[PDB]
Paper text:
[name] is a widely distributed membrane glycoprotein that regulates myeloid cell activity through its interaction with an inhibitory receptor ([name]). [name] is a member of a “paired receptor” family as in addition to this inhibitory receptor there is one very closely related gene with activating potential in humans and several in mice (Akkaya and Barclay, 2010; Wright et al., 2003). We report X-ray crystallography structures for the inhibitory [name], the activating receptor CD200RLa, and a complex between [name] and [name].
The coordinates of [name] were used as a MR search model for the [name]/[name] complex and [name] was built in a map calculated using partial MR phases. The structure of [name] was solved in complex with [name] and contains an NH2-terminal Ig V-like domain followed by a smaller C2-like domain. The structure of the [name]/[name] complex shows near orthogonal binding of the V-like domains of each molecule, whereby the [name] FCC′C″ face and CC′ and FG loops form a concave surface that embraces the relatively flat AGFCC′C″ face and FG loop of [name]. The [name]/[name] interaction buries a total of 1768 Å2 of solvent-accessible area (901 Å2 from [name] and 868 Å2 from [name]) and shows high shape complementarity with a shape correlation score (SC) of 0.69. The interaction interface also shows charge complementarity with acidic patches on [name] complementing basic patches on [name] where a network of polar interactions is clustered. There are two salt bridges with K100 (FG loop) of [name]-forming salt bridges with E106 (beta strand F) and E115 (beta strand G) of [name]. In particular F96 (in the FG loop) of [name] mediates numerous hydrophobic interactions where the phenyl ring sits in a hydrophobic pocket formed by residues in the [name] CC′C″ beta sheet (L45, A61, Y62, K63, T68, N69, and E70). Despite the high content of carbohydrate in both [name] and [name], it is not involved in the interaction, with N-linked glycosylation of both [name] and [name] distant from the interface with the exception of N20 of [name], which lies at the periphery of the interaction interface. In addition to a disulfide bond between beta strands B and F in both IgSF domains of [name], there is an exposed disulfide bond between beta strands F and G in the V-like domain. The distance between the last residues of each molecule in the structural model is ∼12 nm; this appears somewhat smaller than the 14 nm typically found for protein interactions spanning the immunological synapse; however, a further nine residues of [name] need to be accounted for before entering the predicted transmembrane region.
Residue numbers in the entry:
A (entry chain A): 15 to 205
B (entry chain B): 2 to 203
């Protein structure tokens, strides 16, 4: 007896997104409405009236696609997702059997620009520039490190870490960069 | 405000009706009634011009639509149950512009039954004052005597009703109590006084 489904969707920036209605035969349905609430824009609707196959749209300026086929619910598509696409998408289907709902929280992910390099007096630097969300920088093995986060207006975050290791029996280090778009381990050879 | 709705507090095991009045120009297509639940809301019935009234199997012989219309809808429980107590939503679905809810909550009551036992012996008197209602009623003594012996006990039924019994043991109607002994019982903000006197002569 499911009538509502909340879902969080994560999409890499620049990649495809596809959003599906509650799963019901199109002959059964009466009215199907998509409701889009984007960051810093008002609510917004694309409606489809089944019996007469009519549509209406308050949704211009949101840069999304309404994909329709015969005898299937319409779906939302975004070929290449951008930051301004972040927000709330909801397909509201209603049949004589009542109201149904599928809510989507779309979050855009930015992979960080990662740079790394050795330095003066057995030091190293490791940077994950403007990723979303912020990445996390670890080291192997543990050294004398200072790590800082700067937030940018476009919701990206830069994380920068610099480390020293005093003179003993360590000559190779690893910068470990963890992020949803994929972790990586970068190797460095100390000066 | 978009939808006009009033919460309803009506009597248990009797008829109860909920109504929504949608105030707007745009004619809706279909009206849905749902029972607000944790998890998803539950679909109860729809009214549409295209399909008429459609009650979900679950509510088949428990409700009907009392007001057929896209602007004004009423649902009616024929004979309520504690299950039927809770919160309900009327959804107006209009082409081209989202939807509009109206939440109306239903609460069922049982009118109180009060027992008054007065028992007089040698000069002194003991009164017991029992009351069974839903919600629980409030017993208090207005023929005060500042002192006295007195205890109040309550019981909760598998019915859902709640009984409160207050035992007051007077020792002598002198400075103990005035010319009237009042058991006052409050039931949902309403007090009724039960007054007991005593006429002799000379
Ligand atoms: C998302 O999920 C829950 C449970 O399905 C639902 O009750 C709630 O209304 C949804 N959250 C919001 C903010 O709409
Ligand atoms: C949607 O509505 C527009 C403008 O009212 C109309 O031109 C078009 O034929 C309709 N298309 C579909 C696919 O429903
Ligand atoms: C949609 O695309 C236009 C380009 O025509 C751009 O100016 C606008 O910022 C975009 N809006 C959103 C919400 O992405
Ligand atoms: C986000 O802001 C940072 C800092 O200005 C920039 O490097 C990044 O490319 C910005 N824009 C986008 C679309 O990610
Ligand atoms: C990154 O590391 C975390 C633990 O720090 C791990 O749970 C996760 O699997 C890694 N992420 C990816 C995308 O492999
Ligand atoms: C309501 O239903 C109950 C059964 O649960 C029955 O005992 C009672 O007599 C009915 N009352 C009315 C007014 O229909
Ligand atoms: C209530 O609805 C049922 C359908 O389940 C129907 O059989 C009956 O005629 C209706 N009763 C009234 C009084 O409208
Ligand atoms: C809706 O209700 C009003 C009063 O609540 C009533 O007078 C009216 O007939 C109903 N509206 C319509 C369009 O019938
Ligand atoms: C009334 O009073 C006597 C004490 O005088 C006490 O023992 C008895 O339990 C009381 N009876 C009731 C029914 O409360
Ligand atoms: C009820 O008993 C308490 C002490 O247990 C006392 O303070 C109070 O005065 C009594 N009530 C009356 C009406 O005498
Ligand atoms: C409710 O039913 C219980 C039995 O479970 C009974 O003792 C109680 O007094 C009843 N109250 C009313 C108002 O019917």
């Amino acid at each position: 007896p499911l009538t509502q489904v909340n879902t969080t969707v994560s999409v890499q920036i620049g990649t495809k997104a596809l959003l599906c209605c509650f799963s019901i035969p199109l002959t059964k349905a009466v009215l199907i409405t998509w409701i889009i609430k984007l960051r810093g824009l008002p609510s917004c609707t694309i409606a489809y009236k089944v019996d007469t196959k009519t549509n209406e749209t308050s949704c211009l300026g949101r840069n999304i696609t309404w994909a329709s086929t015969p005898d299937h619910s319409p779906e939302l598509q975004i070929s290449a997702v951008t930051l301004q696409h972040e927000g709330t998408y909801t397909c509201e289907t209603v049949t004589p059997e009542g109201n149904f709902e599928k809510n989507y929280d779309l979050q855009v992910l930015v992979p960080p620009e990662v740079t790394y390099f050795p330095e003066k007096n057995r030091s190293a630097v490791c940077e994950a520039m403007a990723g979303k969300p912020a990445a996390q920088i670890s080291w192997s093995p543990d050294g004398d490190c200072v790590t800082t986060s700067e937030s940018h207006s476009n919701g990206t975050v830069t994380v920068r870490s610099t480390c020293h290791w005093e003179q003993n029996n360590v000559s190779d280090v690893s910068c470990i960069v963890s992020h949803l778009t994929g972790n990586q381990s970068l190797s460095i050879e100390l000066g | 405000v978009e939808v006009v709705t009033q919460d309803e507090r009506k009597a248990l095991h009797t008829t109860a009706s909920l109504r929504c009045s949608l105030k707007t120009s745009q004619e809706p297509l279909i009206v849905t009634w749902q029972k607000k639940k944790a998890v998803s809301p539950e679909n109860m019935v729809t009214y549409s011009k295209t399909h008429g009234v459609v009650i979900q199997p679950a509510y088949k012989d428990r409700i009907n639509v009392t007001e057929l219309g896209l602007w004004n809808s009423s649902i009616t429980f024929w004979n309520t149950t504690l299950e039927d107590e809770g919160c309900y939503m009327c959804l107006f679905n209009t082409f081209g512009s989202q939807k509009v809810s109206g939440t109306a909550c239903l609460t069922l009551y049982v009118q109180p039954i009060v027992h008054l036992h007065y028992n007089y012996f040698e000069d002194h008197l003991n009164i017991t004052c029992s009351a069974t209602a839903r919600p629980a009623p409030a017993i208090s003594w207005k023929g005060t005597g500042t002192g006295i012996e007195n205890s109040t006990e309550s019981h909760f039924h598998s019915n859902g009703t709640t009984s409160v019994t207050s035992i007051l043991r007077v020792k002598d109607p002198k400075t103990q109590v005035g010319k009237e002994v009042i058991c006052q019982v409050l039931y949902l903000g309403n007090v009724i006084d039960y007054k007991q006197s005593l006429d002799k002569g000379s």
